[PDB]
Amino acid sequence: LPIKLRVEKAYPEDVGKRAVRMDKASRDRIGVSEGDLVKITGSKTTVARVLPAKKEDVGKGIVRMDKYERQNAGASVGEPVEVDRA
Ligand SMILES: [Zn+2]
Ligand SMILES: [Zn+2]
Ligand SMILES: [Zn+2]
Ligand SMILES: [Zn+2]
Ligand SMILES: [Zn+2]
Ligand SMILES: [Zn+2]
Ligand SMILES: [Zn+2]
């Protein structure tokens, strides 16, 4: 089973990276470490590398995604997506 996390915007420093940020609890729940590939599915599905959360975001059930990943997952900011190992 995947986990669900709420889409939020990427920090500018991560825009144009095929990568998303999620905290360690979230990584632990799907069994991935920083640098591994995750599958992300809103209404569409895409893949991206796992980055750790910024400190301000630890413990939040969010996943930070830039515009390209949001487009490819078919998900808007504030909507949940399913995240699983790739
Ligand atoms: Zn920064
Ligand atoms: Zn990207
Ligand atoms: Zn790993
Ligand atoms: Zn890093
Ligand atoms: Zn939507
Ligand atoms: Zn929000
Ligand atoms: Zn749902």
Side-chain angles (χ1 to χ4, degrees):
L1 283 189
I3 68 171
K4 275 180 180 169
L5 297 164
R6 185 178 79 241
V7 177
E8 294 290 350
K9 279 171 165 180
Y11 292 108
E13 72 199 61
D14 303 313
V15 172
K17 298 179 177 163
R18 295 176 64 186
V20 301
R21 290 192 182 276
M22 66 179 74
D23 69 8
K24 203 136 212 153
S26 299
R27 305 200 292 285
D28 276 358
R29 288 173 71 209
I30 61 171
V32 293
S33 303
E34 172 187 354
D36 293 336
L37 260 191
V38 283
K39 197 176 51 216
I40 305 159
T41 306
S43 61
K44 306 176 200 177
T45 182
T46 194
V47 298
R49 287 92 171 203
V50 173
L51 299 183
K54 295 293 190 176
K55 200 186 285 308
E56 308 93 12
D57 300 318
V58 167
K60 299 173 161 168
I62 67 172
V63 57
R64 287 201 183 275
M65 304 183 13
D66 63 37
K67 197 184 284 162
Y68 185 52
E69 267 71 60
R70 291 191 316 265
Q71 280 174 353
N72 298 338
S76 293
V77 175
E79 293 192 317
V81 285
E82 301 193 328
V83 180
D84 211 340
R85 64 185 53 179

XYZ file of all heavy atoms in Angstrom:
665
model
N 0.831 -1.206 0.000
C 0.000 0.000 0.000
C 0.865 1.256 0.000
O 1.887 1.308 0.687
C -0.933 0.017 1.206
C -2.168 -0.890 1.108
C -3.115 -0.627 2.256
C -2.873 -0.735 -0.232
N 0.475 2.265 -0.776
C 1.183 3.545 -0.729
C 0.758 4.340 0.497
O -0.182 3.989 1.206
C 0.749 4.238 -2.026
C -0.636 3.713 -2.268
C -0.614 2.271 -1.774
N 1.490 5.405 0.765
C 1.039 6.394 1.729
C 0.485 7.596 0.979
O 0.823 7.854 -0.179
C 2.149 6.827 2.695
C 3.214 7.616 1.942
C 2.724 5.599 3.408
C 4.235 8.255 2.874
N -0.374 8.358 1.658
C -0.892 9.605 1.114
C -0.226 10.782 1.811
O -0.044 10.778 3.036
C -2.413 9.707 1.271
C -3.168 9.028 0.166
C -4.650 9.149 0.370
C -5.413 8.448 -0.749
N -6.868 8.352 -0.402
N 0.144 11.783 1.010
C 0.705 13.022 1.509
C 0.105 14.178 0.737
O -0.230 14.043 -0.448
C 2.233 13.052 1.325
C 3.007 11.987 2.104
C 4.448 11.833 1.577
C 2.975 12.306 3.619
N 0.036 15.328 1.392
C -0.551 16.516 0.780
C 0.488 17.243 -0.056
O 1.574 17.550 0.439
C -1.100 17.451 1.857
C -1.830 18.657 1.274
C -2.412 19.548 2.361
N -1.402 20.416 2.987
C -1.082 20.378 4.279
N -1.656 19.489 5.096
N -0.189 21.219 4.760
N 0.149 17.536 -1.317
C 1.064 18.278 -2.190
C 1.199 19.709 -1.692
O 0.196 20.381 -1.397
C 0.555 18.279 -3.639
C 1.463 19.126 -4.543
C 0.381 16.831 -4.190
N 2.438 20.185 -1.581
C 2.701 21.604 -1.390
C 3.797 21.988 -2.379
O 4.464 21.125 -2.951
C 3.121 21.926 0.055
C 2.022 21.687 1.101
C 0.866 22.665 1.050
O 0.895 23.707 0.353
O -0.134 22.347 1.703
N 3.985 23.292 -2.558
C 4.913 23.800 -3.572
C 6.362 23.486 -3.214
O 6.738 23.413 -2.050
C 4.769 25.315 -3.706
C 3.626 25.833 -4.567
C 3.551 27.353 -4.380
C 2.707 28.076 -5.428
N 2.702 29.561 -5.145
N 7.199 23.337 -4.236
C 8.629 23.209 -3.981
C 9.235 24.540 -3.556
O 8.782 25.612 -3.969
C 9.364 22.721 -5.234
N 10.279 24.458 -2.744
C 11.144 25.620 -2.535
C 11.847 25.971 -3.851
O 12.155 25.088 -4.654
C 12.172 25.347 -1.435
C 11.554 25.205 -0.057
C 11.474 23.961 0.562
C 11.038 26.305 0.601
C 10.896 23.825 1.808
C 10.460 26.179 1.860
C 10.394 24.930 2.452
O 9.811 24.787 3.696
N 12.079 27.260 -4.115
C 12.743 27.629 -5.377
C 14.005 26.859 -5.647
O 14.268 26.526 -6.807
C 13.036 29.124 -5.195
C 11.933 29.583 -4.333
C 11.667 28.447 -3.353
N 14.800 26.549 -4.617
C 16.062 25.845 -4.847
C 15.864 24.449 -5.416
O 16.821 23.867 -5.935
C 16.868 25.758 -3.553
C 16.298 24.796 -2.552
C 16.820 25.085 -1.186
O 16.562 26.197 -0.703
O 17.515 24.221 -0.617
N 14.654 23.893 -5.336
C 14.399 22.547 -5.835
C 13.628 22.523 -7.151
O 13.443 21.443 -7.722
C 13.659 21.749 -4.745
C 14.452 21.702 -3.431
O 15.687 21.423 -3.494
O 13.879 21.987 -2.345
N 13.178 23.679 -7.638
C 12.469 23.748 -8.905
C 13.401 23.333 -10.033
O 14.561 23.758 -10.098
C 11.917 25.160 -9.107
C 11.333 25.317 -10.498
C 10.897 25.477 -7.998
N 12.882 22.493 -10.928
C 13.645 21.924 -12.020
C 14.460 20.706 -11.655
O 15.306 20.291 -12.454
N 14.269 20.153 -10.461
C 14.833 18.872 -10.066
C 13.750 17.803 -10.166
O 12.600 18.032 -9.773
C 15.327 18.892 -8.622
C 16.425 19.866 -8.302
C 16.790 19.774 -6.817
C 17.957 20.713 -6.475
N 18.066 20.958 -5.000
N 14.174 16.650 -10.656
C 13.178 15.566 -10.660
C 13.106 14.971 -9.251
O 13.476 13.824 -8.993
C 13.534 14.491 -11.689
C 13.492 14.973 -13.130
C 13.937 13.933 -14.146
N 13.047 12.777 -14.172
C 13.270 11.681 -14.883
N 14.362 11.584 -15.630
N 12.405 10.676 -14.847
N 12.679 15.628 -8.287
C 12.859 15.242 -6.899
C 11.769 15.883 -6.060
O 11.288 16.973 -6.386
C 14.237 15.686 -6.377
N 11.408 15.216 -4.959
C 10.422 15.739 -4.020
C 10.965 15.636 -2.600
O 11.775 14.758 -2.295
C 9.089 14.970 -4.134
C 8.521 15.071 -5.557
C 9.317 13.516 -3.770
N 10.470 16.499 -1.702
C 10.897 16.485 -0.305
C 9.809 15.889 0.579
O 8.643 16.290 0.491
C 11.231 17.892 0.202
C 12.487 18.494 -0.402
C 12.907 19.767 0.360
N 14.095 20.369 -0.266
C 15.340 19.988 -0.014
N 15.586 19.030 0.872
N 16.350 20.570 -0.660
N 10.207 14.963 1.453
C 9.298 14.391 2.439
C 10.092 14.045 3.690
O 11.295 13.772 3.617
C 8.588 13.156 1.883
C 9.497 11.977 1.604
S 8.567 10.555 0.969
C 8.217 11.096 -0.677
N 9.411 14.034 4.839
C 10.152 13.892 6.086
C 10.466 12.420 6.365
O 10.049 11.515 5.630
C 9.407 14.583 7.225
C 8.119 13.881 7.616
O 7.845 12.774 7.116
O 7.391 14.447 8.454
N 11.234 12.167 7.440
C 11.780 10.824 7.641
C 10.684 9.831 7.990
O 10.730 8.673 7.556
C 12.855 10.821 8.732
C 13.836 9.621 8.621
C 15.303 10.054 8.820
C 16.317 9.214 8.012
N 17.581 9.985 7.675
N 9.700 10.262 8.782
C 8.549 9.415 9.066
C 7.888 8.949 7.775
O 7.577 7.763 7.620
C 7.546 10.160 9.949
N 7.713 9.864 6.817
C 7.111 9.501 5.539
C 7.996 8.531 4.765
O 7.520 7.516 4.233
C 6.846 10.762 4.723
O 5.939 11.614 5.409
N 9.293 8.839 4.680
C 10.228 7.912 4.056
C 10.198 6.547 4.738
O 10.158 5.513 4.063
C 11.645 8.490 4.084
C 11.785 9.863 3.465
C 13.254 10.156 3.092
N 14.142 10.299 4.246
C 14.178 11.365 5.039
N 13.378 12.399 4.828
N 15.022 11.402 6.052
N 10.226 6.523 6.074
C 10.190 5.249 6.797
C 8.943 4.441 6.454
O 9.007 3.212 6.324
C 10.244 5.489 8.304
C 11.653 5.663 8.821
O 12.607 5.565 8.011
O 11.795 5.916 10.042
N 7.800 5.117 6.291
C 6.543 4.406 6.087
C 6.493 3.688 4.740
O 5.809 2.666 4.619
C 5.369 5.368 6.233
C 5.099 5.809 7.675
C 4.036 6.897 7.736
N 2.707 6.379 7.430
C 1.727 7.092 6.876
N 1.928 8.363 6.545
N 0.548 6.528 6.640
N 7.255 4.226 3.723
C 7.292 3.437 2.457
C 8.658 2.761 2.290
O 8.842 2.109 1.261
C 6.856 4.241 1.225
C 7.759 5.444 0.970
C 5.394 4.636 1.330
C 7.469 6.096 -0.340
N 9.541 2.874 3.208
C 10.786 2.132 3.146
C 11.782 2.620 2.113
O 12.385 1.798 1.408
N 11.977 3.936 2.008
C 12.949 4.513 1.088
C 13.849 5.465 1.858
O 13.466 6.019 2.890
C 12.285 5.266 -0.083
C 11.548 4.310 -0.975
C 11.349 6.358 0.462
N 15.048 5.677 1.319
C 16.001 6.637 1.856
C 16.198 7.771 0.859
O 15.779 7.691 -0.299
C 17.342 5.958 2.177
O 17.139 4.879 3.075
N 16.897 8.816 1.315
C 17.209 9.992 0.459
C 17.967 9.507 -0.783
O 18.969 8.781 -0.622
C 18.033 11.017 1.242
C 18.549 12.159 0.386
C 19.498 13.106 1.101
O 19.674 12.949 2.325
O 20.057 13.996 0.432
N 17.495 9.899 -1.970
C 18.093 9.506 -3.226
C 17.375 8.386 -3.954
O 17.585 8.227 -5.163
N 16.535 7.617 -3.262
C 15.764 6.554 -3.899
C 14.622 7.123 -4.747
O 14.202 8.271 -4.595
C 15.183 5.602 -2.860
C 16.242 4.812 -2.131
O 17.354 4.624 -2.677
O 15.937 4.339 -1.027
N 14.086 6.275 -5.621
C 13.006 6.646 -6.530
C 11.651 6.335 -5.914
O 11.419 5.210 -5.464
C 13.129 5.862 -7.830
C 13.737 6.459 -9.081
C 13.408 5.460 -10.180
C 13.141 7.826 -9.387
N 10.732 7.296 -5.958
C 9.360 7.017 -5.537
C 8.431 7.173 -6.730
O 8.711 7.899 -7.690
C 8.878 7.895 -4.364
C 9.466 7.389 -3.055
C 9.172 9.366 -4.587
N 7.325 6.447 -6.676
C 6.212 6.650 -7.580
C 5.210 7.561 -6.883
O 4.924 7.385 -5.694
C 5.562 5.309 -7.938
C 4.676 5.316 -9.160
C 4.190 3.879 -9.448
C 3.582 3.240 -8.185
N 3.876 1.775 -8.054
N 4.690 8.540 -7.616
C 3.756 9.522 -7.069
C 2.541 9.566 -7.980
O 2.680 9.815 -9.181
C 4.398 10.916 -6.949
C 5.671 10.828 -6.125
C 3.411 11.918 -6.299
C 6.603 11.978 -6.356
N 1.356 9.312 -7.422
C 0.133 9.217 -8.214
C -0.940 10.115 -7.616
O -1.379 9.895 -6.478
C -0.380 7.771 -8.277
O 0.670 6.907 -8.751
C -1.589 7.666 -9.226
N -1.356 11.109 -8.382
C -2.567 11.842 -8.095
C -3.627 11.253 -8.995
O -4.104 10.145 -8.739
N -4.005 11.969 -10.042
C -4.818 11.367 -11.095
C -3.971 10.757 -12.200
O -4.512 10.027 -13.045
C -5.775 12.402 -11.706
O -5.059 13.480 -12.291
N -2.666 11.067 -12.232
C -1.688 10.501 -13.162
C -0.504 10.002 -12.340
O -0.437 10.212 -11.127
C -1.208 11.530 -14.197
C -2.288 12.229 -14.998
C -1.646 13.273 -15.896
C -2.641 14.320 -16.340
N -1.967 15.360 -17.169
N 0.472 9.369 -12.979
C 1.571 8.826 -12.194
C 2.903 9.290 -12.757
O 3.058 9.451 -13.974
C 1.512 7.292 -12.130
O 2.590 6.823 -11.310
C 1.634 6.678 -13.523
N 3.848 9.534 -11.858
C 5.172 9.985 -12.244
C 6.167 9.399 -11.257
O 5.797 8.708 -10.305
C 5.238 11.516 -12.302
O 6.433 11.912 -13.001
C 5.230 12.145 -10.919
N 7.450 9.641 -11.508
C 8.477 9.163 -10.594
C 9.403 10.325 -10.275
O 9.537 11.268 -11.059
C 9.296 7.983 -11.163
C 8.404 6.792 -11.430
C 10.032 8.420 -12.404
N 10.000 10.270 -9.089
C 10.958 11.294 -8.684
C 11.858 10.756 -7.573
O 11.543 9.777 -6.900
C 10.245 12.577 -8.230
N 12.994 11.413 -7.394
C 13.917 11.019 -6.338
C 13.500 11.638 -5.012
O 12.920 12.722 -4.968
C 15.352 11.448 -6.669
C 16.003 10.615 -7.773
C 15.822 11.211 -9.176
N 16.631 10.515 -10.191
C 17.006 11.051 -11.357
N 16.646 12.294 -11.660
N 17.749 10.355 -12.221
N 13.834 10.958 -3.928
C 13.440 11.388 -2.586
C 14.500 12.325 -2.022
O 15.686 11.979 -1.986
C 13.254 10.189 -1.648
C 13.019 10.677 -0.255
C 12.113 9.332 -2.105
N 14.079 13.503 -1.562
C 14.920 14.416 -0.782
C 14.367 14.539 0.629
O 13.161 14.360 0.848
C 14.967 15.817 -1.402
C 15.522 15.941 -2.819
C 15.545 17.389 -3.224
C 16.911 15.343 -2.884
N 15.193 14.867 1.613
C 14.664 15.063 2.963
C 13.877 16.357 3.051
O 13.953 17.231 2.188
C 15.914 15.107 3.847
C 17.037 15.420 2.932
C 16.624 15.216 1.514
N 13.090 16.465 4.120
C 12.352 17.691 4.368
C 13.275 18.781 4.899
O 14.280 18.514 5.574
C 11.230 17.469 5.382
N 12.916 20.021 4.598
C 13.524 21.130 5.313
C 13.015 21.116 6.745
O 11.934 20.590 7.034
C 13.186 22.461 4.640
C 13.767 22.610 3.245
C 15.273 22.700 3.299
C 15.854 23.105 1.949
N 17.338 23.268 2.074
N 13.820 21.682 7.650
C 13.498 21.603 9.071
C 12.110 22.143 9.385
O 11.361 21.533 10.160
C 14.547 22.340 9.885
C 14.534 21.895 11.302
C 15.487 22.752 12.083
C 16.894 22.286 11.731
N 16.990 20.802 11.915
N 11.734 23.271 8.779
C 10.402 23.846 8.979
C 9.276 22.864 8.702
O 8.163 23.056 9.212
C 10.195 25.069 8.063
C 11.286 26.083 8.156
C 12.354 25.859 7.109
O 12.125 25.065 6.179
O 13.445 26.442 7.251
N 9.535 21.822 7.913
C 8.498 20.912 7.464
C 8.530 19.546 8.136
O 7.669 18.719 7.834
C 8.588 20.717 5.944
C 8.421 22.013 5.174
O 7.552 22.817 5.543
O 9.173 22.239 4.202
N 9.499 19.269 9.017
C 9.539 17.950 9.643
C 8.239 17.711 10.400
O 7.673 18.630 11.003
C 10.764 17.822 10.561
C 10.655 16.597 11.463
C 12.022 17.744 9.729
N 7.738 16.482 10.333
C 6.486 16.133 10.968
C 5.234 16.579 10.245
O 4.132 16.333 10.745
N 5.348 17.228 9.094
C 4.161 17.566 8.328
C 3.908 16.467 7.312
O 4.844 15.934 6.702
C 4.302 18.911 7.614
C 4.518 20.136 8.513
C 4.813 21.327 7.623
C 4.595 22.661 8.298
N 5.182 23.749 7.452
N 2.642 16.136 7.131
C 2.294 15.073 6.210
C 2.215 15.588 4.789
O 1.226 15.357 4.093
N 3.245 16.305 4.346
C 3.242 16.922 3.027
C 4.331 16.299 2.180
O 5.222 15.604 2.672
C 3.442 18.449 3.071
C 4.855 18.774 3.560
C 2.383 19.117 3.927
C 5.182 20.250 3.441
N 4.238 16.568 0.880
C 5.290 16.250 -0.078
C 5.450 17.472 -0.971
O 4.466 17.969 -1.540
C 4.981 14.972 -0.890
C 3.632 15.062 -1.648
C 6.147 14.672 -1.859
N 6.665 18.028 -1.018
C 6.892 19.245 -1.783
C 7.300 18.884 -3.203
O 8.265 18.142 -3.411
C 7.942 20.135 -1.110
C 7.409 20.827 0.158
C 8.210 22.052 0.542
N 7.725 22.640 1.790
C 6.721 23.500 1.868
N 6.078 23.893 0.768
N 6.369 23.987 3.056
N 6.566 19.440 -4.174
C 6.708 19.121 -5.588
C 6.684 20.389 -6.427
O 5.809 21.237 -6.239
C 5.551 18.204 -6.042
C 5.484 16.979 -5.211
S 4.238 15.758 -5.661
C 3.680 16.241 -7.273
N 7.596 20.489 -7.399
C 7.525 21.607 -8.325
C 6.448 21.372 -9.385
O 5.744 20.359 -9.380
C 8.893 21.854 -8.980
C 9.382 20.673 -9.826
O 8.541 20.021 -10.497
O 10.615 20.407 -9.813
N 6.340 22.331 -10.312
C 5.231 22.347 -11.251
C 5.283 21.148 -12.182
O 4.243 20.603 -12.560
C 5.242 23.658 -12.043
C 3.951 23.998 -12.751
C 4.090 25.266 -13.600
C 4.094 26.550 -12.748
N 4.658 27.758 -13.493
N 6.483 20.743 -12.594
C 6.576 19.624 -13.518
C 6.078 18.332 -12.866
O 5.272 17.594 -13.454
C 8.019 19.492 -14.025
C 8.167 18.424 -15.083
C 7.344 18.411 -16.201
C 9.127 17.438 -14.958
C 7.493 17.442 -17.176
C 9.279 16.457 -15.928
C 8.459 16.470 -17.023
O 8.604 15.488 -17.974
N 6.526 18.048 -11.638
C 6.044 16.858 -10.929
C 4.547 16.930 -10.651
O 3.838 15.914 -10.750
C 6.812 16.685 -9.612
C 8.043 15.767 -9.737
C 9.177 16.403 -10.530
O 9.657 17.460 -10.106
O 9.573 15.867 -11.586
N 4.040 18.110 -10.286
C 2.605 18.220 -10.045
C 1.824 17.951 -11.325
O 0.817 17.238 -11.308
C 2.257 19.596 -9.479
C 2.771 19.796 -8.072
C 2.221 21.035 -7.414
N 2.190 22.261 -8.220
C 3.134 23.204 -8.209
N 4.222 23.054 -7.465
N 2.994 24.304 -8.953
N 2.288 18.493 -12.446
C 1.653 18.207 -13.727
C 1.678 16.718 -14.043
O 0.665 16.145 -14.466
C 2.353 18.997 -14.824
C 1.914 20.433 -14.898
C 2.730 21.232 -15.894
O 3.725 20.743 -16.446
N 2.322 22.471 -16.120
N 2.824 16.062 -13.834
C 2.924 14.657 -14.222
C 2.203 13.732 -13.257
O 1.866 12.613 -13.643
C 4.378 14.218 -14.346
C 5.123 14.980 -15.420
O 4.523 15.534 -16.337
N 6.445 15.013 -15.306
N 2.000 14.147 -12.008
C 1.190 13.376 -11.086
C -0.280 13.726 -11.185
O -1.096 13.077 -10.524
C 1.678 13.590 -9.640
N -0.641 14.722 -11.984
C -2.017 15.191 -12.036
C -2.538 15.594 -10.677
O -3.579 15.098 -10.232
N -1.829 16.500 -9.997
C -2.272 16.885 -8.669
C -1.939 18.343 -8.469
O -0.901 18.817 -8.937
C -1.622 16.020 -7.590
N -2.835 19.044 -7.809
C -2.674 20.446 -7.489
C -2.128 20.588 -6.079
O -2.188 19.663 -5.263
C -4.010 21.183 -7.613
O -4.427 21.222 -8.968
N -1.572 21.766 -5.812
C -1.189 22.110 -4.450
C -2.394 21.947 -3.526
O -3.509 22.378 -3.849
C -0.634 23.540 -4.415
C -0.361 23.949 -2.994
C 0.634 23.636 -5.276
N -2.172 21.313 -2.372
C -3.206 21.152 -1.365
C -4.008 19.879 -1.486
O -4.823 19.588 -0.591
N -3.811 19.109 -2.577
C -4.470 17.829 -2.824
C -3.585 16.672 -2.384
O -2.365 16.740 -2.512
C -4.750 17.641 -4.311
C -5.749 18.558 -4.900
C -6.153 18.076 -6.284
O -5.268 17.676 -7.067
O -7.363 18.072 -6.577
N -4.142 15.558 -1.927
C -3.304 14.402 -1.593
C -2.830 13.674 -2.840
O -3.440 13.742 -3.908
C -4.232 13.504 -0.762
C -5.390 14.389 -0.372
C -5.543 15.344 -1.524
N -1.709 12.970 -2.684
C -1.189 12.057 -3.695
C -0.760 10.790 -2.993
O -0.375 10.819 -1.823
C 0.034 12.613 -4.468
C -0.389 13.649 -5.464
C 1.059 13.163 -3.492
N -0.784 9.676 -3.735
C -0.267 8.406 -3.242
C 1.195 8.256 -3.620
O 1.567 8.443 -4.785
C -1.077 7.240 -3.815
C -2.527 7.367 -3.427
C -3.348 6.156 -3.659
O -3.099 5.376 -4.599
O -4.247 6.014 -2.838
N 2.017 7.896 -2.642
C 3.460 7.791 -2.816
C 3.892 6.378 -2.449
O 3.546 5.876 -1.375
C 4.194 8.827 -1.946
C 5.692 8.704 -2.155
C 3.700 10.227 -2.276
N 4.657 5.743 -3.332
C 5.103 4.376 -3.123
C 6.519 4.208 -3.648
O 7.027 5.054 -4.386
C 4.182 3.378 -3.840
C 4.086 2.052 -3.126
O 4.981 1.733 -2.308
O 3.093 1.334 -3.380
N 7.164 3.109 -3.299
C 8.507 2.878 -3.816
C 8.395 2.647 -5.318
O 7.417 2.079 -5.778
C 9.167 1.697 -3.108
C 8.478 0.365 -3.327
C 9.128 -0.743 -2.489
N 9.209 -0.384 -1.075
C 9.705 -1.159 -0.117
N 10.184 -2.368 -0.393
N 9.722 -0.723 1.126
N 9.380 3.097 -6.087
C 9.329 2.952 -7.536
C 9.767 1.587 -8.065
O 10.606 0.928 -7.479
C 10.133 4.058 -8.192
Zn 17.323 27.155 0.979
Zn 10.930 18.708 -10.800
Zn 17.466 2.911 -0.296
Zn 20.406 16.241 0.414
Zn -7.095 17.885 -8.710
Zn -1.121 24.234 1.812
Zn -7.310 10.010 -1.658
